[PDB]
Amino acid sequence: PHQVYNVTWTITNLVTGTKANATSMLGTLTDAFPTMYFDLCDIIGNTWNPSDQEPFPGYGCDQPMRRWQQRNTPFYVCPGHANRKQCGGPQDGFCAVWGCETTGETYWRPTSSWDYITVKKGVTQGIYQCSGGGWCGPCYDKAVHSSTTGASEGGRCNPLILQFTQKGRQTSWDGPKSWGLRLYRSGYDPIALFSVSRQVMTITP
Numbered sequence: 001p002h003q004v005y006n007v008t009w010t011i012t013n014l015v016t017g018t019k020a021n022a023t024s025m026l027g028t029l030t031d032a033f034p035t036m037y038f039d040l041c042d043i044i045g046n047t048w049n050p051s052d053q054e055p056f057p058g059y060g061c062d063q064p065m066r067r068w069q070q071r072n073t074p075f076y077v078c079p080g081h082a083n084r085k086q087c088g089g090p091q092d093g094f095c096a097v098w099g100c101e102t103t104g105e106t107y108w109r110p111t112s113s114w115d116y117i118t119v120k121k122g123v124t125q126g127i128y129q130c131s132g133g134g135w136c137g138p139c140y141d142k143a144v145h146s147s148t149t150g151a152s153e154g155g156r157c158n159p160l161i162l163q164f165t166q167k168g169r170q171t172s173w174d175g176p177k178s179w180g181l182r183l184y185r186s187g188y189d190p191i192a193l194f195s196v197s198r199q200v201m202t203i204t205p
């Protein structure tokens with residue numbers, strides 16, 4: 001009865017244009033606001049991964065330990081849909097100055113009363129010593145070294161969870177909205193850009 005349409009929400013890698021993930025559900029524009037799930041490594045761009053000449057940088061999506069150390073690093077998120085000059089643009093992840101963040105996971109627990117979403121780390125076993133002392137866990141790509149237990153495809157172990165806020169559930173979604181995500185480190189804070197958009201189509205069969 002309330003299932004008038006098939007609403008699909010998509011999280012997009014801003015730079016590459018690829019789909020980090022998607023979720024569909026039946027309902028209306030006012031009640032279809034599902035919880036989204038995606039991995040950080042599916043939204044990074046060409047300039048995120050540290051160079052190969054760079055010794056144990058502490059983050060990155062191209063190597064298991066890089067992915068693991070990245071997982072244990074805090075991060076903050078800034079909206080790029082509000083046109084706040086002081087926060088800068090995509091090249092700053094919309095976080096040019098402190099106070100631009102509206103969510104994420106850091107010691108000061110950023111939240112917001114005006115932004116449309118919240119983003120927190122999901123659950124993962126990441127990496128752990130198992131049985132024979134070797135390293136086991138999802139951070140390892142099962143398609144790069146099978147046998148290594150826990151190994152997931154892609155080596156995904158940076159799950160993020162996105163939820164819509166009350167303000168988010170009440171704002172208009174005509175056109176995509178973008179956000180920037182930054183790792184909070186003692187040194188450069190790498191930038192990852194993503195977008196959220198909605199499609200509304202008829203049900204089938």
Ligand SMILES: *[C@@H]1O[C@H](CO)[C@@H](O[C@@H]2O[C@H](CO)[C@@H](O)[C@H](O)[C@H]2NC(C)=O)[C@H](O)[C@H]1NC(C)=O
Nearest residue numbers: 006007008022024025026199201202203204205
């Ligand atoms: C509309 O909703 C339906 C489910 O109610 C979606 O249909 C499934 O979509 C997945 C991929 O997203 C396919 O792998 C399944 O085979 C589809 N099931 C069938 C046969 O309906 C559909 O994707 C949604 N609209 C779209 C195409 O975005």
Ligand SMILES: *[C@@H]1O[C@H](CO)[C@@H](O[C@@H]2O[C@H](CO)[C@@H](O)[C@H](O)[C@H]2NC(C)=O)[C@H](O)[C@H]1NC(C)=O
Nearest residue numbers: 020021022023024036037038039122156159160
């Ligand atoms: C892509 O999105 C789907 C949801 O459409 C994710 O699947 C959900 O994952 C959570 C967390 O593990 C579970 O609690 C749900 O039960 C899952 N839902 C369904 C329908 O499977 C999926 O994990 C996401 N993929 C990635 C790598 O983020």
